[PDB]
Symmetry: D2
Subunit: 158 residues, 4 copies
């Protein structure tokens, strides 16, 4: 069953007041989309971030993985910058999966890393506390963020 | 300074490539908006979810706290249901803060609790894994979500 | 060239501040997307709305055109109901093009017809005044809306 | 009523499947928000665009009307740049209304002018064809878009 047919079913359940939350078939399709991704685009031009992401993703799938040629810092003027960055990458590059990391919402709100599919659907995300608070190396932070975004949909890096 | 003037500064930084993450003034402003709120709307008609949220928020601020008299489950046909739920409350109720909890993304993607201000800005949020995995009492889940959403922007419940 | 490449050039212009509005290549690519579409989904379960749009779209392309099995009225709790209806159709059906027609914005704001591409991108659109004013048959309104949305990107129905 | 209550009424009609389009009260309320605005922000730092919009809006209301100090062209990397410009101005300026004009959607998709209220709700909008086609002066174009955006919610200059 294709993702669209799985989502159709969820939407019908919601409309008709029988939706009881996420279902096993749905989680499985999510996992499948990530693990089976053949091409992955990371919505950054910052080589530091890219390498942390790429190395982890290589433990889970057999995709070609690349970053962007433009600076996505301008997403930082939007309401939800991490998400904006993911849709910028979706507009300019064809891929199976898009991974973005940046600010969650307003200045002050900490960070969000998000994984989108090829139509811009939010498959998974994870957040860190504002760097003003945690003060960890950005490298260690992104690593923890990616790993938690995967574990929360049943994907272990082993 | 006013929130709008704080955000203008952040935006100027990003436009001109000198933005080095969240700043103290920015964190402080968010905490202030939450701690000083006079009216809070919880973006549900579900009594159980409301009570859990309210009892916590009364530990941190002195607001009148109320829930909605419409079912926001129809948000579940949109891309980011939890955010959609916040913006429905924003459209139909006047408050200083809006709290919503729902599915993060596509079916299977787990949960998001989000706090929005007076103009729909994302102030903070937290996520839980797909209920398919964690399998916890929802009321215990929402407690953990709200406390982490507060703690990641410097607000302690104790 | 591929749409992604075209958009990348535009974004590059914008970043550098040499963007002087839409380009012939961009118009040509939009036209191509529409005229060459093989499958079109109308984001509605309303047979009247469907028939109007179908018969017009058949004058411009050789697609299979269908509607949905679910009522996309629930998009009418969101900020931008017409756009929300398009993104619901995108989530539940595969197609080259999605056409949605509903309320522009807040209650009282009149109507929007919008055409999206297979990744959710906005190709063209058109509006009618609020029905409280114009008082015309819905089918006559949708016909005029569609024909406008097509002529403003250089597509003639004649 | 307050706008929030008029909106709840409308949403309730929708949930129950009895919504039969816009209503006179909702249209009145939109007109009211526009004509009675005391402050308006034009979401641009472009003087020519600002001036065309200001001179028209001064015929409809008695507001203070101002533009931004930042270039909102960075909106042009998002899916719907005109709307994004609106919500940038909302984030950095208090006002009763916000007016933005820029590209509707994808490169090549033509223009949109939009008017948002103080919570970012979409009150009205208007579109022009791709400039590649109409080939008009941008100032004539914006005059026509604002006028149509006002006239479609019952506001005559
Ligand atoms: C509608 C919906 C959905 O499809 N998926 C999720 C993700 C997930 O299941 O983790 C959520 C949170 C959701 O939204 P909502 O907060 O409205 O949850 C709807 C229903 O889905 C089940 N559910 C949601 N979150 C939890 C949870 O944390 N624990 C348990 N036991 N059930 C849950 C409950 O029956 C609940 O009434
Ligand atoms: C632009 C931006 C922002 O204003 N705030 C935040 C939230 C926060 O500061 O916690 C983020 C994540 C952000 O986006 P981006 O991922 O582009 O990070 C921007 C810059 O802000 C700093 N920064 C962001 N996240 C971290 C972190 O986890 N650790 C450290 N040390 N610095 C960080 C770095 O200078 C980094 O290059
Ligand atoms: C950045 C941008 C774009 O890529 N496409 C469009 C649609 C279109 O070209 O029809 C617009 C409106 C736009 O946004 P903005 O209002 O910021 O226009 C950017 C530049 O694009 C040109 N332009 C935009 N609207 C018009 C117009 O109505 N007439 C003419 N001659 N040029 C125009 C001008 O050079 C202008 O400085
Ligand atoms: C839900 C909704 C709404 O509240 N307002 C508007 C703006 C407006 O009233 O002008 C629209 C377009 C709408 O969405 P939708 O296309 O789903 O219409 C819902 C119903 O609202 C009435 N309606 C909408 N557009 C027209 C129109 O162009 N002509 C007429 N006569 N009725 C209309 C019809 O009863 C229709 O069944």
């Amino acid at each position: 069953v294709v993702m669209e047919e799985i989502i159709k079913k969820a939407f019908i359940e919601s409309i008709n007041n029988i939706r009881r939350g996420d279902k096993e078939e749905e989680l499985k399709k999510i996992q499948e989309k990530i693990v089976n991704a053949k091409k992955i685009v990371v919505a950054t031009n910052n080589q530091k971030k890219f390498k942390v992401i790429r190395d982890i993703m290589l433990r889970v799938c057999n995709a070609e993985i690349k970053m962007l040629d433009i600076d996505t810092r301008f997403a930082d003027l939007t309401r939800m910058p991490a998400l904006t960055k993911g849709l910028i990458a979706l507009d300019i590059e064809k891929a199976d999966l898009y991974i973005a990391r940046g600010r969650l919402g307003a200045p002050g709100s900490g960070s969000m890393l998000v994984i989108l599919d090829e139509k811009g659907r939010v498959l998974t995300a994870s957040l860190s506390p504002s760097s003003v608070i945690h003060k960890e190396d950005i490298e260690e932070r992104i690593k923890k963020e990616l790993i938690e975004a995967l574990s929360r949909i049943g994907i272990s890096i082993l």
